[PDB]
Each structure stands twice: as structure tokens, then as C-alpha cells.
Amino acid sequence: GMKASLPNRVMLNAYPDSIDGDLAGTVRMLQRPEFTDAFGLFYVLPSIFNSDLDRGFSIIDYDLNSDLASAEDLAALDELGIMLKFDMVLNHLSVGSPQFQDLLKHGDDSAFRDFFIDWNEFWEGEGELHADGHVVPSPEHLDRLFMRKPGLPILQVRFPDGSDRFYWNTFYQRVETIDGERSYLGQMDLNAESPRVWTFYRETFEKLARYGAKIVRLDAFAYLHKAVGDTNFFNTPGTWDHLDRLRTISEENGLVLLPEIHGEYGTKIHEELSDRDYPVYDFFFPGLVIDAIDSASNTHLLRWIDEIIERDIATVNMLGCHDGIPVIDLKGGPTGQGLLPDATIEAMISRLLERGGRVKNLYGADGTKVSYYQVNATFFSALGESDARLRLARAIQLFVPGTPQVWYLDLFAGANDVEAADRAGADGHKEINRTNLSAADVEAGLARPIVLDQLEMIRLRNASPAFDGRFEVVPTDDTRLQLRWQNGSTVALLDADLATERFTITHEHDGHTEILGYDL
């Protein structure tokens, strides 16, 4: 099964240039003694490929960006025993991609005339034309539309016959002008009904497998299927049909599929994905662990831990990542109940804002905000810039079921990068949590307890066979958390106290008992 194929190793996560300018910089760091056998997985963000906008997620092609990465870096990571996780950004390609450039060059004669989505074609007979030339969907359709920005998800482009056409653009765009020249970049949505797109998916899977990929992340997968009259967020059954088709291709290359979906807990999308034998991200744990630590109570976190076991959910969990801390994910959806009460989520957002966080909301086409979505902040800052809270969150993360993803910047306890978040010309508030580190930063960090203590726990989690065995929550009062893994005679026990923020890790292996602890 695919869930069972998810490797249970600790997974590093970073941009190829997060450490000393390029992926060779991360390799050199990984070759240090402190990092020996720390990670068996590495999710390298998509700027490892040729790309422009959205720091890697506007893909030109899936060859490596030679400024930042090479096949020699991948061989060096394989030498270290590190398997790879990469994106397939299957919902869209850059305007600068060869497919879209061919569309702009040959227009209606292009072999890719059906590869992307002409907006006015898509909505033909389902809306009135705006003065600007684009089709405004009828109110019945526009209401249902899930929107990741104000206005419509369209970019106007220039075809070789001199016409201006509107192409579907759910996410980023850039429009530059001077004298007579209008240039544009953007993430142009792919037509999932096109056999050419599916041929590109298969070739891309083969390319990623050749690079040494073991996991392929289906970026923004819920947005792929589009249909007049639907919301275009996880449309069904269309989204399931696309996923099963990808699954087949994935299996032919020996790859594990991990669809990225920020569904509200109360929709139970994560349960449906798991029941269909797909691993999922754990976007509930980040907020739950903050709430558990901020309140010194395990009640909400334990409930979610119990459902992972009861529902047999294979996850990739995390503290921070390249996006913000998910908060909408904790809600109950349209009718259901969330993992934290609405009021508890909002109060957590307020605290995170007091700690320098910056909220990121969702807005409908009519401009009215729908809800908070994420909170942009480093996890170190989200926890009040306390080494003890970050050590505790890491320890809990490593003992919860699931593959633990480690954000490079949390490993080095980076605080909010306020300067980067406000810099004119930067990517905005997500920069608060994307600081690039030098080799010097790395060195100085390897003398810090907050970095070394995390690495000691990481190396244990990545190597001990205990975590390949049975998981158990040892009953305690609600201010403590005692998590136990046993594989035959090998036992790993986390005994944590949320009130005092103290904890110890006991590891029994080959009759030898060693204790990890960072307070005494």
C-alpha cells in the first residue's frame, strides 16, 4: 500500500539556497559529524528546478537550476543515505515554460492550444463580457467560486494574431509595463482534461524518479479540477479521478504520492484521503502543539493523536514550513466541528500577532474576506522565542505518529525576519520565515544547545527501530504527555510536562538504557 510505503525517516526541508547559497552548501552541512544519520529524507523546494516567480512554484521546466543545484549534489545526498522529496507543481506552469511560450508564439496553431485554460472559452455562455474583454461568470457561478485573490483568476496575454486573450491564473502573476511594451509572468493553470498535460505528468514523474525522488508532493492538488458551476476546490468526483490516475503513474515509478491540501478538519477530506490509501500532510499539529504549549494542556492534541491511530492516518507532520502556520485547517468546515473551537483559534491568532506574526486571509471574488488562512511567522517566534518551548515542540513532533519534516530555519531557531517581510520587491510576508543562512550562521548554530539538542533528538528519531513499531499514549493528567514507541525490545519513551516545559527521552536498545534531557 502507498501509506505503508511512506518512509518513516526524519525529513529535512529547505530551499536549495537556504544554506550557503546553493544545494552544495546544504550537503556540506549535512556532512558535518553533528548531522550524521540525522535525516533519511530531504524535501527540496521547487526552486531546485528552473523557475521564476513564487520562489520555485512558477516552473519553467523540471531540469535543475544550475545556479542552485546539480546532479552532483543529489549524488552527494544519496551518498549520505538521504532520499529525496520533490514537487510536481501539476496545477500550473510559468508563462516562461516552453509549453506556454509555444502557445504565445503559434497561438491557435500551437500544439499546446489545449494545454492551458482559455478563460473566455471556459465560461462561454455562462457570463457576460466585461468592458475589459474578459467573461464575468454569472452570479450563480461566481458565488460558488473559490478564490485565492481579489477579482477573477485570470491573466490577460497577447496572442500572435494581435488579440488579447484571458488565461486561467489561480495564483501569482506579474505585469510589467513601459512605453509600448507590456510583459507578464505568471502561474498559468494547466488543463487537466488534455492528454498532453497527462503525458507531461508521466514524463515529469519519470524525471523526478531519475533524480532519486521517493516522494512526489502534489502541490495545490485541490485546485486542479475546474468546472463551471463548482467551487474548484476539491471538486468531486473529478479530483478523485485525477488522483487515482496519478497514483497509477506514480506506482510505475516506485514513488509515494503526497497531495498538498489545506482542508478544514471538519470537512474530513484528510479522512477520505487516508481511507483511499493516500498519505496526507498533518496541518493540524502545528496549531495544536502551539495551543497545547500555550495552555499547558494536552486535551485537544490528544484527541487528534487518537484519531490518527483510530483512523490509521499516515502523515507527514511538521512545525514550520515554507508557508505560514495553518489556522483555517483547524476549523469545522461548513457544518462540522473543528479540532479547536473557533474562539480558541482566534485567540491563538491574536497571540501569534502579538509575537510578530502576520495573518494571511482568504477573500471571495466580492472582496469580502472568507476567513483567516495562515499566520506568517517562524515557529521559534510563534512559541515566544523560548528554546525550551521549541525543544518541547520538536520532541512532541518526533514522538507523534508520522514522518517528521524539519524546517531548516526552526532547526537553527530563526526568529521572525521582519526586515525581509517588509522589504520592497520581496515576496511579502512569507519572507518572515524564509531567511537564508550562511555557512557562518550554520557553524555558530552548531555551538548552540537549541540546535544541538534538536539534532540529538532528530538522530535518535531517524535511527531507532522503536519508531518502526507500536505507538502508545501512556495515560497521564492533562498537563503531561507521555508517548511511547516499542519495536520488540527497543523502546523510546517521551515523558513531557507541559506546565514546566520539561521532558526526558528514555531509549532502551540492546539492553542498554540512555536518557536524553536538556534541563539537568
Numbering used by the authors: 5 to 524
What does the paper say about this structure?
One of the most well-studied GPs in that regard is sucrose phosphorylase (SP; EC 2.4.1.7), which catalyzes the phosphorolysis of sucrose into α-d-glucose 1-phosphate (Glc1P) and d-fructose. Crystal structures of the two SPPs were determined to allow for a comparison of their active site.
In this work, we report the expression and characterization of an SPP from Ilumatobacter coccineus YM16–304 (IcSPP) with active site sequence motifs that are different from the motifs found in TtSPP or in the phosphorylases with other specificities in the GH13_18 subfamily. The enzyme shows high activity on sucrose 6F-phosphate, but unlike TtSPP, it does not catalyze reactions with alternative substrates. The IcSPP crystals contained one protein molecule in the asymmetric unit, whereas the TtSPP crystals contained two. Domain A (residues 1–93, 198–328, and 389–470 in IcSPP) is the largest and forms the (β/α)8-barrel that is characteristic to the GH13 family. In IcSPP, the inner sheet immediately flanking the barrel is considerably larger and formed by three strands instead of two. IcSPP also has an additional set of two strands constituting a third, outermost β-sheet. IcSPP seems to exist as a monomer, whereas TtSPP in the crystal structure forms dimers. In the structure of IcSPP, a phosphate ion is found interacting with Arg152, Glu264, Asp327, Tyr377, and Gln378 in the active site. In IcSPP, the predicted binding partners are Arg152, Glu264, Lys364, Gln378, and Lys434.
